[PDB]
Amino acid sequence: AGLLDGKRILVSGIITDSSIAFHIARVAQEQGAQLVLTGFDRLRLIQRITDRLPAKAPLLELDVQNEEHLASLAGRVTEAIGAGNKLDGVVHAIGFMPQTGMGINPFFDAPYADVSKGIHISAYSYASMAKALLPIMNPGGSIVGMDFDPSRAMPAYNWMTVAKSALESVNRFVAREAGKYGVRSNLVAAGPIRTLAMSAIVGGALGEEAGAQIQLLEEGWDQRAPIGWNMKDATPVAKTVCALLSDWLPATTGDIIYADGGAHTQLL
Amino acid sequence: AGLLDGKRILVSGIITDSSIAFHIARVAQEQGAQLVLTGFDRLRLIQRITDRLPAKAPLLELDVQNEEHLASLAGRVTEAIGAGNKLDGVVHAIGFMPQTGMGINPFFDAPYADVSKGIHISAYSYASMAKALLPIMNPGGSIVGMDFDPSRAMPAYNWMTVAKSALESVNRFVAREAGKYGVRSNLVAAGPIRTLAMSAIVGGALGEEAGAQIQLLEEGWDQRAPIGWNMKDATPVAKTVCALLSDWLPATTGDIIYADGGAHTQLL
Numbered sequence: 001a002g003l004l005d006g007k008r009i010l011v012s013g014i015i016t017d018s019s020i021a022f023h024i025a026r027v028a029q030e031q032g033a034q035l036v037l038t039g040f041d042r043l044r045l046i047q048r049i050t051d052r053l054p055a056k057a058p059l060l061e062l063d064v065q066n067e068e069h070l071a072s073l074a075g076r077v078t079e080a081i082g083a084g085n086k087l088d089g090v091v092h093a094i095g096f097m098p099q100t101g102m103g104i105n106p107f108f109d110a111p112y113a114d115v116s117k118g119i120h121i122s123a124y125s126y127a128s129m130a131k132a133l134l135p136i137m138n139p140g141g142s143i144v145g146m147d148f149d150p151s152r153a154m155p156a157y158n159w160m161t162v163a164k165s166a167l168e169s170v171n172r173f174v175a176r177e178a179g180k181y182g183v184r185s186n187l188v189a190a191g192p193i194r195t196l197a198m199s200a201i202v203g204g205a206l207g208e209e210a211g212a213q214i215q216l217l218e219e220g221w222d223q224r225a226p227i228g229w230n231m232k233d234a235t236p237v238a239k240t241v242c243a244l245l246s247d248w249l250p251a252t253t254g255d256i257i258y259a260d261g262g263a264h265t266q267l268l
Numbered sequence: 269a270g271l272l273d274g275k276r277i278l279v280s281g282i283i284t285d286s287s288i289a290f291h292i293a294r295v296a297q298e299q300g301a302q303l304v305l306t307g308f309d310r311l312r313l314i315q316r317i318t319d320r321l322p323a324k325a326p327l328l329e330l331d332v333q334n335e336e337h338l339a340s341l342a343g344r345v346t347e348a349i350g351a352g353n354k355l356d357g358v359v360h361a362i363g364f365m366p367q368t369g370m371g372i373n374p375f376f377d378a379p380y381a382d383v384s385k386g387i388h389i390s391a392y393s394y395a396s397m398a399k400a401l402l403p404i405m406n407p408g409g410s411i412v413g414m415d416f417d418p419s420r421a422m423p424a425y426n427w428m429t430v431a432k433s434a435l436e437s438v439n440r441f442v443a444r445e446a447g448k449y450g451v452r453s454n455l456v457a458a459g460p461i462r463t464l465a466m467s468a469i470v471g472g473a474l475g476e477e478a479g480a481q482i483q484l485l486e487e488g489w490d491q492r493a494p495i496g497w498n499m500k501d502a503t504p505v506a507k508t509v510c511a512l513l514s515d516w517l518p519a520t521t522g523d524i525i526y527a528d529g530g531a532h533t534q535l536l
């Protein structure tokens with residue numbers, strides 16, 4: 001067994017043992033996968049976290065906002081995974097929005113320059129990463145991004161929700177391109193998870209009201225979710241992406257998979 | 269009669285007698301409205317077109333990308349419409365994407381810098397215009413933007429479709445803010461219309477394939493539309509926005525109104 005046996009998945013995200021990426025990576029590895037990692041800013045730190053993973057995995061720098069990193073991605077991955085080999089999976093657990101477009105700050109009040117690098121890192125990054133790595137994929141490969149239902153306005157999230165709405169719209173376009181390589185591109189829309197930086201926001205982080213608005217949003221969930229919703233266990237979201245990086249969901253691409261306890265489907 | 273009798277609607281867009289904005293403005297005026305206009309780049313030209321309108325209307329410069337214009341909008345509109353008066357409507361007939369994110373150019377191939385000012389002008393502009401004018405609206409006012417169903421990938425449009433998906437997501441957030449002023453914000457999703465620059469693209473404009481891909485998309489429509497779809501008559505789209513700027517659609521905000529012959533609802 002090993003759902004993901006002898007597969008090469010490259011994982012994005014992992015910033016702390018709290019990060020979802022981290023949890024996919026573990027579940028992934030127990031499942032027989034073989035990762036290669038991408039780090040962003042504090043590489044030495046990611047490095048140290050990455051060591052508690054059930055298995056060693058090469059880590060590589062990558063600021064999704066720097067061309068030369070992207071220019072050189074593919075080389076690097078091969079160079080590591082070893083030539084004559086290609087990868088079967090790529091996971092985009094990444095996003096970011098500046099103080100302003102999120103939190104307490106009124107909505108109309110975010111600078112388009114701020115709003116922008118959010119879009120640049122949260123949505124557009126999906127395309128860059130795919131155009132860059134699509135050339136090294138075995139057929140029947142999988143590309144996956146982490147989503148958060150932006151289909152109805154919620155409060156406090158503001159422009160991060162707008163950035164996700166774009167994510168949803170970019171994925172459809174990547175599905176089109178990946179199609180030619182016989183590779184799939186999909187989004188897993190998670191329920192709220194207590195990641196670190198989430199934690200910080202439900203604390204005083206972005207504001208008081210902002211915070212109390214999450215708290216509540218966070219509770220609507222478990223209520224609504226017919227099978228409930230644990231905001232502290234990213235394991236169910238990890239096993240889904242794990243289903244998607246696998247060959248058991250072969251006829252589905254442009255798609256979004258609600259890994260949310262059912263919440264999105266119930267009114268109250 | 270005069271659906272829009274003694275109402276102050278400020279219209280965005282009008283670049284040629286072909287432009288939709290132009291058509292709303294006419295229908296608007298025959299309906300008893302009283303406009304005030306916004307021009308973008310070639311003001312003298314807009315000016316000359318604007319004269320064939322059934323009625324005189326003050327025109328004002330406004331590059332939705334220049335802060336000081338937005339900073340000074342409200343003053344200008346009052347200054348014109350005359351102090352002690354407020355407007356009941358605002359129409360956002362505006363958008364734009366650089367060669368690259370549209371047309372023949374592959375999707376992965378657009379620079380985020382290009383992709384960006386599209387987003388900046390097409391989506392984000394909706395928010396700026398609203399934060400700026402919301403202070404001068406009578407209650408039960410209306411804000412309307414022009415939409416184009418981005419809910420399924422289409423070809424050739426690329427990033428303009430992504431920009432509209434964001435538009436749809438911004439509107440929901442503006443509905444929230446407009447709510448406090450008791451003003452409404454909605455999107456009219458049009459079918460394809462032969463505007464000038466559209467014309468140019470179905471000609472050789474953006475590319476050959478790009479062009480032949482519109483042509484076809486353009487025909488799927490009238491087929492699909494149970495009551496059909498005339499790509500050369502922007503009158504039905506104009507009368508809808510006209511319904512929406514009016515008090516007959518009072519309980520509906522965050523919304524998108526399909527002004528499309530029914531196309532969006534039928535598979536084949």
Ligand SMILES: NC(=O)c1ccc[n+]([C@@H]2O[C@H](COP(=O)([O-])OP(=O)(O)OC[C@H]3O[C@@H](n4cnc5c(N)ncnc54)[C@H](O)[C@@H]3O)[C@@H](O)[C@H]2O)c1
Binds near residue numbers: 093
């Ligand atoms: N946590 C939630 O409640 C929730 C729910 C549904 C979806 N998601 C999405 O899941 C994804 C995973 O994020 P998370 O919540 O695990 O949080 P997280 O704080 O662990 O960080 C996600 C990452 O963004 C990275 N980042 C920012 N700029 C970058 C850049 N230039 N290059 C590379 N990485 C960069 C950080 O290094 C970090 O890894 C997020 O994108 C989030 O939108 C999250």
Ligand SMILES: NC(=O)c1ccc[n+]([C@@H]2O[C@H](COP(=O)([O-])OP(=O)(O)OC[C@H]3O[C@@H](n4cnc5c(N)ncnc54)[C@H](O)[C@@H]3O)[C@@H](O)[C@H]2O)c1
Binds near residue numbers: 308458
């Ligand atoms: N034509 C269609 O098939 C179609 C269909 C559905 C929706 N829409 C939308 O309808 C809206 C109306 O556009 P149209 O198709 O009538 O085309 P159009 O070419 O008449 O131009 C729309 C406008 O964008 C303006 N523009 C660009 N940058 C600007 C700036 N910085 N400041 C102010 N104006 C600026 C131009 O001046 C022009 O008026 C568009 O936004 C389009 O997305 C169009």
